[PDB]
Amino acid sequence: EKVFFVTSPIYYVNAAPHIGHVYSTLITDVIGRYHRVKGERVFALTGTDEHGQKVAEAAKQKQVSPYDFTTAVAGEFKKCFEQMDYSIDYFIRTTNEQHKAVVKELWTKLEQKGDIYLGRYEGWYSISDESFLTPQNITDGVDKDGNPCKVSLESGHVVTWVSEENYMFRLSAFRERLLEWYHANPGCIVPEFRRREVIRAVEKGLPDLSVSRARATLHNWAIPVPGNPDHCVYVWLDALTNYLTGSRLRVDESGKEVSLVDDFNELERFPADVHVIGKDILKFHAIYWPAFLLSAGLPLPKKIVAHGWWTKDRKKNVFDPVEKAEEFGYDALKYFLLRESGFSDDGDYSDKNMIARLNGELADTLGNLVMRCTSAKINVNGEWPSPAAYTEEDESLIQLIKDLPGTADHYYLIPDIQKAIIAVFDVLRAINAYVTDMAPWKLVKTDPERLRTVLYITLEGVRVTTLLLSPILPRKSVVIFDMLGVPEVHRKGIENFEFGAVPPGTRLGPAVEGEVLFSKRSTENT
């Protein structure tokens, strides 16, 4: 097989990192984490998009060199992402000398294949989105001065007219084939309604894309077109190539890049198994990216998943990812974002709701359940008991726990992480209802033979749910497993998705004094 290759979009370094970037990368991170938990080879990629007019003109407005500015902001992105405790394998920068090489090579391939020609683009362009737009996608709006101007219907930013001699990619010639690709691979774009957006857009027709810009326009802050120093490679063709680059970089233990391989196969990563993106950058990944790859005779990605947030921009609920993490907890925060947000963001991100979920699901449902099946009160010998005979209620719960991995697996592979969490927690609420009925606290006295059966199922339930919640709560899953005393070997691998991987007689971990797994926040805000 292959290295499971998951990516996030590489973010413009025009401004400090914020929740949006963190969320996108968090999705990339989780998908990665779950595949490692299945014991697969993983390579999760993230990074910054440093070239372009947008970034150049942000660096100019802060009275600083593009090189110095992008290094600065890039550093802030890395710091942020380190604080968030992702398990990302590499942070790429499009200023990397080796990335530049891949871009020049891809361009040459495109030119050699006959799909790049010298023409003009005369039309609208949004600098903030670095996006060509047709007149149907612009409208009337207000310049930040206050004067009347034209803006993008998509994003809302100011659009400007551009008339330039540019190099043009023959995107038009790839309509028939992109349509074949969407139809033949109906999981390739997720969620389904966005997939239908891409097909209708492409069905309507595709014009040629301008893959270069005049040197001056971009303030010489971009990759030169091979064989034409007066032009620069479109920031987006540059940016997209990051995926091919990352697939070709050998990385040391520091996470520093040490070599660029000649051919993507050497590292067994390309094409991406999943590109995590946001809704604002769909066309670049679903239309251009493959059209480029089809031209160069490279393989197409397997899945693009486009979540409900804007990868860029400040909208809505002011969140500092790190200040909320320090406030409510890191794993708790990540859980909250992944649980509360589905594919259309009808999400309630208020403090009230965060507290309600942390208290509700993380403390009451998961938390209380862990503390019960490890309590000296209930689990008197601090060990995994041997179950006696199973009742029909016993087996009904066992069935749920046995089916959870199959279900959770599918949801992660769509991927729909929200559905995966709900799936797991459905099984947790069930376990709690079982314990409530069985009153194990009473059985300690009455029927110890029975309690063995009840404790074992509860323990195994907790174990398997926690295993499946480990890509969401990576730190707290370790705290859980320590409490249950699960050996390191049983914390990973599809072998341990099975009911009863941990044998009876396994001892629980040391009970720490005044220990709380998820501490309850104050429900009463006023």
CA distance 334 to 391: 38
According to DSSP, the β-strands at 274-278 and 4-7 are parallel
Q: How many CB atoms lie within 10 A of CB 230?
A: 11
- Closer residue to ligand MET, CB minimum distance, 96 or 242: 242
**What is the DSSP annotation of 289-348?**
HHHHHHHHTPPPPS-EEEESS-SSS-------HHHHHHHH-HHHHHHHHHHH--SS----
Residue 312 is a binding residue for ligand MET (CB under 6 A): yes
Indicate the DSSP class of residue 86: -
- Single residue of 4, 5, 6, 9 touching ligand MET by CB under 6 A: 9
Q: How far is the CB of 473 from ligand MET (least distance, A)?
A: 28
- Closer residue to ligand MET, CB minimum distance, 23 or 411: 23
- Single residue of 30, 32, 42, 49 touching ligand MET by CB under 6 A: 49
- Closer residue to ligand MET, CB minimum distance, 126 or 212: 126
Q: How many CB atoms lie within 10 A of CB 509?
A: 15
Sites for ligand MET among residues 225-264 (CB under 6 A)? 239-240, 242
- Closer residue to ligand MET, CB minimum distance, 286 or 483: 286
Segment lying near ligand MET (by CB under 6 A), choices 7-15, 78-86, 350-358, 413-421: 7-15
Shortest Cβ contact with ligand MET: which residue?
49
Residue 331 is a binding residue for ligand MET (CB under 6 A): no
Sites for ligand MET among residues 287-306 (CB under 6 A)? none
- Closer residue to ligand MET, CB minimum distance, 111 or 130: 130
Name the nearest CA neighbour of 24 among 52, 55, 46: 46
Residue 281 is a binding residue for ligand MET (CB under 6 A): yes
Residue 210 is a binding residue for ligand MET (CB under 6 A): no
- Closer residue to ligand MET, CB minimum distance, 155 or 341: 155
Q: How far is the CB of 8 from ligand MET (least distance, A)?
A: 8
Q: How far is the CB of 416 from ligand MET (least distance, A)?
A: 22
Name the nearest CA neighbour of 312 among 201, 488, 155: 155
Residue 10 is a binding residue for ligand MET (CB under 6 A): yes
Residue 13 is a binding residue for ligand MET (CB under 6 A): no
Q: How far is the CB of 282 from ligand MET (least distance, A)?
A: 11
Name the nearest CA neighbour of 450 among 390, 382, 377: 390
CA distance 46 to 294: 24
Name the nearest CA neighbour of 388 among 308, 313, 443, 349: 443
Q: Please give the backbone phi and psi of residue 233, each rounded to the nearest 5 degrees, phi first.
A: -60, 120
Tokens for 445, please give them: 């006295």
**How many residues of this chain interact with ligand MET, rule: CB under 6 A?**
11
Specify whether the CB–CB gap between 132 and 124 falls below 8 A. Answer: yes
Longest dimension (CA), the chain: 87
Q: How far is the CB of 215 from ligand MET (least distance, A)?
A: 21
Segment lying near ligand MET (by CB under 6 A), choices 6-14, 318-326, 456-464, 495-503: 6-14
Indicate the DSSP class of residue 491: G
Q: How far is the CB of 99 from ligand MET (least distance, A)?
A: 11
200: exposed, middle or buried (C-beta count within 10 Å: 0-12, 13-18, 19+)? exposed
Residue 484 is a binding residue for ligand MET (CB under 6 A): no
Q: Where along the sequence are the contacts to ligand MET (CB under 6 A)?
A: 9-12, 49, 239-240, 242, 281, 311-312
